[model samples]
Target: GSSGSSGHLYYCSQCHYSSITKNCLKRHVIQKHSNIL
Candidate 1:
């Protein structure tokens, strides 16, 4: 039998950003939204 498969996800509330890992998302927020904050 085949069931639904879901994977881990990390997304930014400030923008349309998503990733599988928090480390990558964190880096993106800091590098991209650093000045916005």
Candidate 2:
């Protein structure tokens, strides 16, 4: 079982990555997307 996707409040357009919260999204981008620019 996992958290519901209905409340996936944060997502990154760069990679179509989704997170349950903005904090997780920020951390994800920092690690994998920070160098894309």
Tell me the TM-score of each prediction against the true structure: 0.55, 0.56
| 10 residues in a row with least lDDT, candidate 2 | 1-10
The number of the candidate with the highest lDDT is 1
**What is candidate 2's lDDT per residue for 1-37, written digit by digit as tens?**
6675475467885687888777778888888775455
Give the clashing residue pairs of candidate 1, or none: none
Model 2 ranges with Cα > 4 A deviation: 1-7, 35-37
Cα lDDT tens digits for candidate 1, 1-37: 6888577689885788788788778887888785464
Clash list (residue pairs), candidate 2? none
Alpha carbon lDDT of residue 29, candidate 2?
84
**Model 2 vs. true fold: TM:** 0.56
